[PDB]
Subunit: 142 residues, 3 copies
Protein backbone atom coordinates (compact mmCIF):
# COMPACT_ATOMS: atom_id res chain seq x y z
CA UNK A 1 0.00 0.00 0.00
CA UNK A 2 1.09 3.63 0.06
CA UNK A 3 4.50 4.02 1.64
CA UNK A 4 4.27 0.44 2.87
CA UNK A 5 7.35 -1.56 2.05
CA UNK A 6 11.01 -0.95 1.23
CA UNK A 7 11.53 2.38 -0.53
CA UNK A 8 12.31 2.01 -4.25
CA UNK A 9 15.04 4.22 -5.76
CA UNK A 10 14.30 4.95 -9.43
CA UNK A 11 16.25 6.87 -12.09
CA UNK A 12 15.76 5.73 -15.66
CA UNK A 13 15.05 6.83 -19.20
CA UNK A 14 14.57 5.25 -22.60
CA UNK A 15 14.39 7.52 -25.67
CA UNK A 16 14.42 7.37 -29.43
CA UNK A 17 15.41 9.44 -32.42
CA UNK A 18 12.71 11.29 -34.34
CA UNK A 19 13.44 14.12 -36.82
CA UNK A 20 16.50 15.63 -35.06
CA UNK A 21 19.47 16.12 -37.37
CA UNK A 22 22.74 15.53 -35.57
CA UNK A 23 24.96 18.57 -35.03
CA UNK A 24 28.76 18.23 -34.75
CA UNK A 25 30.18 18.42 -31.25
CA UNK A 26 26.70 18.37 -29.63
CA UNK A 27 24.84 15.60 -27.77
CA UNK A 28 22.42 13.62 -29.92
CA UNK A 29 18.92 14.77 -28.97
CA UNK A 30 16.57 11.79 -28.74
CA UNK A 31 13.04 13.24 -28.43
CA UNK A 32 10.76 10.17 -28.59
CA UNK A 33 10.05 9.23 -24.96
CA UNK A 34 9.54 5.57 -24.15
CA UNK A 35 10.12 6.35 -20.45
CA UNK A 36 11.39 9.37 -18.51
CA UNK A 37 9.24 9.48 -15.38
CA UNK A 38 11.87 11.13 -13.15
CA UNK A 39 12.68 13.79 -15.80
CA UNK A 40 16.37 12.92 -15.33
CA UNK A 41 16.90 12.91 -19.10
CA UNK A 42 16.58 16.30 -20.85
CA UNK A 43 15.34 15.96 -24.43
CA UNK A 44 16.25 19.60 -25.08
CA UNK A 45 19.94 18.76 -24.64
CA UNK A 46 20.26 14.98 -24.97
CA UNK A 47 21.91 14.64 -21.56
CA UNK A 48 21.04 12.42 -18.61
CA UNK A 49 21.82 13.93 -15.16
CA UNK A 50 22.58 11.78 -12.13
CA UNK A 51 20.47 12.66 -9.10
CA UNK A 52 21.03 9.46 -7.07
CA UNK A 53 24.65 8.26 -6.71
CA UNK A 54 25.13 4.65 -7.76
CA UNK A 55 25.85 2.16 -10.52
CA UNK A 56 24.07 2.79 -13.85
CA UNK A 57 23.58 0.69 -16.98
CA UNK A 58 23.46 2.39 -20.41
CA UNK A 59 22.50 0.72 -23.69
CA UNK A 60 22.02 2.18 -27.19
CA UNK A 61 20.92 0.73 -30.54
CA UNK A 62 21.33 2.52 -33.84
CA UNK A 63 19.87 1.89 -37.27
CA UNK A 64 22.77 2.61 -39.68
CA UNK A 65 21.75 4.00 -43.08
CA UNK A 66 23.22 6.19 -45.85
CA UNK A 67 26.49 6.98 -44.02
CA UNK A 68 28.75 5.30 -41.51
CA UNK A 69 27.87 5.64 -37.83
CA UNK A 70 30.48 6.36 -35.17
CA UNK A 71 29.26 7.36 -31.71
CA UNK A 72 30.81 8.06 -28.34
CA UNK A 73 29.20 7.68 -24.91
CA UNK A 74 30.36 10.62 -22.76
CA UNK A 75 30.51 10.86 -18.99
CA UNK A 76 30.97 14.35 -17.44
CA UNK A 77 33.40 15.74 -20.00
CA UNK A 78 35.09 12.65 -21.45
CA UNK A 79 34.34 10.05 -24.13
CA UNK A 80 34.16 6.67 -22.36
CA UNK A 81 33.04 4.21 -25.04
CA UNK A 82 33.15 4.12 -28.86
CA UNK A 83 30.99 2.25 -31.40
CA UNK A 84 31.74 2.26 -35.17
CA UNK A 85 29.58 0.61 -37.86
CA UNK A 86 30.44 1.15 -41.51
CA UNK A 87 27.62 1.45 -44.04
CA UNK A 88 27.68 -0.09 -47.50
CA UNK A 89 25.04 0.55 -50.14
CA UNK A 90 21.83 -1.47 -49.84
CA UNK A 91 22.89 -2.80 -46.44
CA UNK A 92 21.15 -1.12 -43.50
CA UNK A 93 22.98 -2.20 -40.34
CA UNK A 94 22.39 -2.33 -36.58
CA UNK A 95 25.00 -0.98 -34.14
CA UNK A 96 24.83 -1.22 -30.35
CA UNK A 97 26.79 -0.62 -27.18
CA UNK A 98 26.25 -1.01 -23.45
CA UNK A 99 28.30 -0.45 -20.28
CA UNK A 100 28.05 0.03 -16.53
CA UNK A 101 29.24 3.34 -15.10
CA UNK A 102 29.32 4.46 -11.49
CA UNK A 103 27.96 8.04 -11.19
CA UNK A 104 27.97 10.75 -8.54
CA UNK A 105 25.34 13.44 -8.18
CA UNK A 106 25.67 15.93 -10.99
CA UNK A 107 27.45 13.64 -13.43
CA UNK A 108 26.00 13.71 -16.94
CA UNK A 109 25.96 11.00 -19.57
CA UNK A 110 25.04 11.36 -23.25
CA UNK A 111 25.73 10.08 -26.75
CA UNK A 112 27.55 12.16 -29.41
CA UNK A 113 28.65 11.53 -32.95
CA UNK A 114 32.37 10.81 -32.74
CA UNK A 115 34.98 13.47 -33.48
CA UNK A 116 33.76 16.32 -35.64
CA UNK A 117 30.50 14.54 -36.45
CA UNK A 118 30.93 13.19 -40.04
CA UNK A 119 29.90 9.55 -39.42
CA UNK A 120 26.35 10.49 -38.58
CA UNK A 121 24.29 7.84 -40.41
CA UNK A 122 21.85 7.36 -37.52
CA UNK A 123 18.36 6.61 -38.82
CA UNK A 124 14.75 6.62 -37.64
CA UNK A 125 11.31 6.99 -39.24
CA UNK A 126 7.78 5.82 -38.44
CA UNK A 127 8.88 2.15 -38.38
CA UNK A 128 12.66 2.27 -37.64
CA UNK A 129 14.27 3.25 -34.35
CA UNK A 130 17.58 4.39 -32.87
CA UNK A 131 17.43 4.37 -29.08
CA UNK A 132 19.31 5.26 -25.89
CA UNK A 133 18.43 3.82 -22.45
CA UNK A 134 19.92 4.25 -19.01
CA UNK A 135 18.94 3.17 -15.50
CA UNK A 136 20.06 3.10 -11.89
CA UNK A 137 20.93 -0.49 -10.98
CA UNK A 138 22.44 -0.14 -7.47
CA UNK A 139 22.06 2.99 -5.35
CA UNK A 140 25.08 3.75 -3.20
CA UNK A 141 24.79 3.17 0.54
CA UNK A 142 27.02 4.60 3.23
CA UNK B 1 11.78 -8.98 -0.15
CA UNK B 2 12.77 -9.35 -3.81
CA UNK B 3 10.21 -8.76 -6.59
CA UNK B 4 11.19 -11.08 -9.48
CA UNK B 5 9.73 -11.35 -12.96
CA UNK B 6 12.09 -12.22 -15.79
CA UNK B 7 12.65 -14.44 -18.76
CA UNK B 8 15.36 -15.07 -21.36
CA UNK B 9 14.59 -17.30 -24.32
CA UNK B 10 15.99 -18.33 -27.70
CA UNK B 11 14.82 -19.44 -31.11
CA UNK B 12 14.97 -23.12 -32.07
CA UNK B 13 12.90 -22.94 -35.27
CA UNK B 14 13.52 -19.86 -37.34
CA UNK B 15 10.47 -20.28 -39.56
CA UNK B 16 8.04 -17.50 -38.68
CA UNK B 17 4.33 -16.98 -39.28
CA UNK B 18 3.12 -13.55 -40.48
CA UNK B 19 1.19 -11.51 -37.94
CA UNK B 20 1.98 -13.91 -35.12
CA UNK B 21 4.43 -13.81 -32.22
CA UNK B 22 7.90 -15.18 -32.76
CA UNK B 23 7.77 -18.23 -30.51
CA UNK B 24 11.13 -18.47 -28.74
CA UNK B 25 11.15 -21.93 -27.12
CA UNK B 26 14.68 -22.46 -25.78
CA UNK B 27 14.64 -21.49 -22.09
CA UNK B 28 17.68 -19.74 -20.63
CA UNK B 29 15.56 -18.55 -17.67
CA UNK B 30 11.80 -18.54 -16.96
CA UNK B 31 11.57 -19.29 -13.24
CA UNK B 32 8.30 -17.43 -12.62
CA UNK B 33 6.63 -18.95 -15.72
CA UNK B 34 5.68 -15.42 -16.78
CA UNK B 35 6.79 -16.09 -20.38
CA UNK B 36 4.53 -18.53 -22.23
CA UNK B 37 6.55 -20.55 -24.76
CA UNK B 38 3.36 -21.90 -26.31
CA UNK B 39 2.51 -18.38 -27.54
CA UNK B 40 5.73 -16.33 -27.42
CA UNK B 41 4.16 -13.84 -25.03
CA UNK B 42 5.36 -12.35 -21.73
CA UNK B 43 2.59 -11.71 -19.19
CA UNK B 44 3.01 -8.87 -16.69
CA UNK B 45 2.19 -10.09 -13.15
CA UNK B 46 3.84 -7.20 -11.22
CA UNK B 47 3.22 -3.58 -12.32
CA UNK B 48 6.42 -1.66 -12.92
CA UNK B 49 9.24 -0.72 -15.20
CA UNK B 50 10.59 -3.51 -17.43
CA UNK B 51 13.72 -3.78 -19.63
CA UNK B 52 13.47 -5.76 -22.87
CA UNK B 53 16.44 -6.72 -25.08
CA UNK B 54 16.62 -8.92 -28.18
CA UNK B 55 19.44 -10.09 -30.47
CA UNK B 56 18.90 -11.64 -33.88
CA UNK B 57 21.21 -13.52 -36.23
CA UNK B 58 20.36 -12.13 -39.71
CA UNK B 59 20.80 -14.70 -42.49
CA UNK B 60 19.41 -15.36 -46.01
CA UNK B 61 16.81 -12.55 -45.90
CA UNK B 62 16.46 -9.13 -44.38
CA UNK B 63 15.18 -8.96 -40.80
CA UNK B 64 12.65 -6.47 -39.56
CA UNK B 65 10.99 -6.99 -36.15
CA UNK B 66 8.60 -5.10 -33.94
CA UNK B 67 8.28 -5.30 -30.13
CA UNK B 68 4.53 -5.39 -29.36
CA UNK B 69 2.79 -4.39 -26.14
CA UNK B 70 -0.98 -5.00 -25.96
CA UNK B 71 -1.21 -5.47 -29.76
CA UNK B 72 0.56 -2.13 -30.44
CA UNK B 73 3.97 -2.00 -32.14
CA UNK B 74 6.29 -0.06 -29.82
CA UNK B 75 9.86 -0.46 -31.18
CA UNK B 76 11.30 -1.39 -34.56
CA UNK B 77 14.60 -2.94 -35.67
CA UNK B 78 15.58 -3.37 -39.35
CA UNK B 79 18.76 -5.05 -40.70
CA UNK B 80 19.26 -5.77 -44.42
CA UNK B 81 21.04 -8.99 -45.45
CA UNK B 82 23.59 -9.17 -48.27
CA UNK B 83 24.81 -12.53 -49.57
CA UNK B 84 27.73 -14.02 -47.62
CA UNK B 85 27.28 -11.43 -44.84
CA UNK B 86 25.51 -12.80 -41.78
CA UNK B 87 24.65 -9.83 -39.55
CA UNK B 88 23.57 -9.16 -35.95
CA UNK B 89 20.59 -6.95 -35.16
CA UNK B 90 19.50 -5.91 -31.66
CA UNK B 91 17.11 -3.61 -29.83
CA UNK B 92 16.37 -2.73 -26.22
CA UNK B 93 13.98 -0.41 -24.42
CA UNK B 94 12.28 0.29 -21.09
CA UNK B 95 8.50 -0.07 -20.99
CA UNK B 96 6.19 0.53 -18.07
CA UNK B 97 3.65 -2.29 -17.72
CA UNK B 98 0.44 -2.87 -15.79
CA UNK B 99 -0.77 -6.24 -14.56
CA UNK B 100 -2.16 -8.21 -17.50
CA UNK B 101 -0.19 -6.40 -20.18
CA UNK B 102 1.45 -8.76 -22.68
CA UNK B 103 4.66 -8.18 -24.68
CA UNK B 104 6.16 -10.14 -27.58
CA UNK B 105 8.14 -9.83 -30.80
CA UNK B 106 6.74 -10.16 -34.33
CA UNK B 107 8.16 -9.96 -37.83
CA UNK B 108 7.27 -6.51 -39.11
CA UNK B 109 4.39 -5.78 -41.42
CA UNK B 110 3.34 -8.58 -43.75
CA UNK B 111 6.20 -10.76 -42.46
CA UNK B 112 8.46 -10.89 -45.53
CA UNK B 113 11.63 -9.66 -43.73
CA UNK B 114 11.89 -12.86 -41.75
CA UNK B 115 15.62 -13.70 -42.04
CA UNK B 116 15.86 -14.55 -38.34
CA UNK B 117 18.14 -17.49 -37.71
CA UNK B 118 19.07 -20.01 -35.05
CA UNK B 119 20.41 -23.55 -35.04
CA UNK B 120 22.60 -25.77 -32.91
CA UNK B 121 25.44 -23.18 -32.86
CA UNK B 122 23.71 -19.87 -33.65
CA UNK B 123 21.24 -17.94 -31.47
CA UNK B 124 18.50 -15.32 -31.64
CA UNK B 125 17.28 -14.29 -28.20
CA UNK B 126 14.63 -12.26 -26.35
CA UNK B 127 14.99 -11.19 -22.68
CA UNK B 128 12.87 -9.16 -20.33
CA UNK B 129 12.95 -8.31 -16.63
CA UNK B 130 11.30 -6.25 -13.95
CA UNK B 131 13.61 -3.42 -12.93
CA UNK B 132 11.41 -1.41 -10.51
CA UNK B 133 8.07 -2.56 -9.11
CA UNK B 134 5.53 0.24 -8.86
CA UNK B 135 4.90 1.81 -5.46
CA UNK B 136 2.85 4.62 -4.02
CA UNK C 1 19.56 -0.39 3.71
CA UNK C 2 21.77 -3.13 2.27
CA UNK C 3 22.16 -3.67 -1.49
CA UNK C 4 23.50 -6.92 -2.90
CA UNK C 5 26.05 -5.88 -5.57
CA UNK C 6 28.08 -7.99 -7.98
CA UNK C 7 28.86 -6.48 -11.37
CA UNK C 8 31.55 -5.83 -13.95
CA UNK C 9 31.89 -3.99 -17.25
CA UNK C 10 35.11 -4.38 -19.22
CA UNK C 11 36.58 -3.70 -22.64
CA UNK C 12 39.13 -5.14 -24.97
CA UNK C 13 42.50 -3.36 -25.18
CA UNK C 14 45.55 -4.91 -26.83
CA UNK C 15 44.84 -8.55 -25.92
CA UNK C 16 44.87 -10.97 -28.89
CA UNK C 17 42.47 -13.94 -28.77
CA UNK C 18 43.74 -17.51 -28.66
CA UNK C 19 41.76 -20.68 -29.50
CA UNK C 20 39.96 -22.36 -26.64
CA UNK C 21 40.87 -19.59 -24.15
CA UNK C 22 38.69 -16.96 -22.45
CA UNK C 23 38.91 -13.50 -23.99
CA UNK C 24 40.75 -11.22 -21.55
CA UNK C 25 39.04 -7.83 -21.44
CA UNK C 26 41.33 -5.44 -19.48
CA UNK C 27 39.76 -1.94 -19.71
CA UNK C 28 37.83 -1.58 -16.49
CA UNK C 29 34.63 0.46 -16.71
CA UNK C 30 33.50 -1.10 -13.39
CA UNK C 31 34.68 -4.02 -11.26
CA UNK C 32 34.25 -2.83 -7.70
CA UNK C 33 33.71 -6.28 -6.13
CA UNK C 34 36.65 -7.83 -8.03
CA UNK C 35 34.30 -10.64 -9.13
CA UNK C 36 35.67 -10.43 -12.69
CA UNK C 37 39.29 -11.59 -12.88
CA UNK C 38 41.17 -9.70 -15.59
CA UNK C 39 44.06 -12.17 -15.34
CA UNK C 40 41.80 -14.91 -16.75
CA UNK C 41 38.80 -13.22 -18.41
CA UNK C 42 36.36 -14.98 -16.08
CA UNK C 43 33.48 -13.77 -13.97
CA UNK C 44 32.90 -15.81 -10.79
CA UNK C 45 29.53 -16.02 -9.01
CA UNK C 46 29.92 -14.92 -5.39
CA UNK C 47 26.17 -14.29 -4.73
CA UNK C 48 23.67 -16.99 -5.91
CA UNK C 49 21.03 -15.30 -8.04
CA UNK C 50 19.90 -14.15 -11.45
CA UNK C 51 22.52 -12.42 -13.63
CA UNK C 52 22.32 -10.40 -16.86
CA UNK C 53 25.21 -10.56 -19.34
CA UNK C 54 25.62 -8.34 -22.42
CA UNK C 55 28.49 -8.07 -24.91
CA UNK C 56 29.21 -5.86 -27.93
CA UNK C 57 31.93 -6.57 -30.49
CA UNK C 58 33.43 -4.42 -33.22
CA UNK C 59 33.84 -6.82 -36.18
CA UNK C 60 36.84 -5.93 -38.39
CA UNK C 61 39.13 -7.81 -40.85
CA UNK C 62 37.75 -11.30 -40.11
CA UNK C 63 34.46 -12.97 -39.26
CA UNK C 64 33.53 -12.99 -35.57
CA UNK C 65 31.87 -15.90 -33.81
CA UNK C 66 31.79 -15.94 -29.99
CA UNK C 67 30.40 -18.33 -27.39
CA UNK C 68 29.29 -17.33 -23.90
CA UNK C 69 30.44 -20.12 -21.53
CA UNK C 70 28.95 -21.06 -18.15
CA UNK C 71 30.81 -23.67 -16.10
CA UNK C 72 32.78 -25.01 -19.09
CA UNK C 73 29.77 -25.33 -21.45
CA UNK C 74 28.91 -22.99 -24.32
CA UNK C 75 25.45 -21.46 -23.58
CA UNK C 76 24.98 -18.90 -26.36
CA UNK C 77 26.43 -18.22 -29.83
CA UNK C 78 26.78 -14.99 -31.80
CA UNK C 79 28.05 -14.99 -35.42
CA UNK C 80 28.75 -11.96 -37.64
CA UNK C 81 30.52 -12.23 -41.01
CA UNK C 82 32.95 -9.48 -42.07
CA UNK C 83 32.85 -8.19 -45.65
CA UNK C 84 35.67 -6.01 -46.96
CA UNK C 85 35.26 -2.33 -46.12
CA UNK C 86 32.33 -3.06 -43.80
CA UNK C 87 33.08 -2.89 -40.07
CA UNK C 88 30.14 -4.47 -38.23
CA UNK C 89 28.71 -4.56 -34.71
CA UNK C 90 27.70 -7.85 -33.09
CA UNK C 91 25.99 -8.23 -29.70
CA UNK C 92 24.34 -10.73 -27.40
CA UNK C 93 22.63 -10.72 -24.03
CA UNK C 94 20.97 -13.30 -21.79
CA UNK C 95 19.82 -13.94 -18.21
CA UNK C 96 21.42 -16.88 -16.40
CA UNK C 97 20.80 -18.10 -12.88
CA UNK C 98 24.14 -18.78 -11.18
CA UNK C 99 25.22 -20.73 -8.12
CA UNK C 100 28.39 -20.38 -6.09
CA UNK C 101 31.34 -21.56 -8.13
CA UNK C 102 29.78 -20.93 -11.53
CA UNK C 103 32.09 -19.06 -13.87
CA UNK C 104 31.00 -17.11 -17.00
CA UNK C 105 33.24 -15.88 -19.84
CA UNK C 106 33.43 -15.31 -23.58
CA UNK C 107 35.50 -17.37 -26.04
CA UNK C 108 35.96 -17.45 -29.78
CA UNK C 109 33.75 -20.21 -31.18
CA UNK C 110 35.13 -23.58 -32.16
CA UNK C 111 38.75 -23.69 -33.20
CA UNK C 112 39.14 -19.95 -32.78
CA UNK C 113 39.57 -18.77 -36.37
CA UNK C 114 36.54 -16.38 -36.41
CA UNK C 115 38.43 -13.92 -34.26
CA UNK C 116 37.82 -10.51 -35.90
CA UNK C 117 37.22 -8.77 -32.59
CA UNK C 118 38.57 -5.23 -32.63
CA UNK C 119 39.47 -2.46 -30.22
CA UNK C 120 41.80 0.52 -30.30
CA UNK C 121 41.92 4.07 -28.92
CA UNK C 122 38.57 4.89 -30.56
CA UNK C 123 36.82 1.51 -31.00
CA UNK C 124 35.53 -0.81 -28.27
CA UNK C 125 34.46 -4.42 -27.73
CA UNK C 126 32.87 -4.95 -24.31
CA UNK C 127 31.50 -7.54 -21.89
CA UNK C 128 29.21 -6.62 -18.94
CA UNK C 129 27.46 -8.68 -16.28
CA UNK C 130 25.45 -7.86 -13.16
CA UNK C 131 23.46 -9.47 -10.39
CA UNK C 132 19.82 -8.56 -10.96
CA UNK C 133 18.06 -10.62 -8.21
CA UNK C 134 19.89 -12.28 -5.33
CA UNK C 135 18.37 -15.60 -4.23
CA UNK C 136 16.49 -15.49 -0.93
CA UNK C 137 15.40 -18.14 1.58
CA1 LIG D 1 22.85 -5.34 -42.54
CA1 LIG E 1 28.10 -9.01 -40.93
CA1 LIG F 1 28.58 -2.41 -41.05
NA1 LIG G 1 25.14 -5.39 -36.64
Amino acid sequence: GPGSGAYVYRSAFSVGLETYVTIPNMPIRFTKIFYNQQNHYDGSTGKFHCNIPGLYYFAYHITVYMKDVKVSLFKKDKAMLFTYDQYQENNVDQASGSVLLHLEVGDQVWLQVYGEGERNGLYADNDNDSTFTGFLLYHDTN
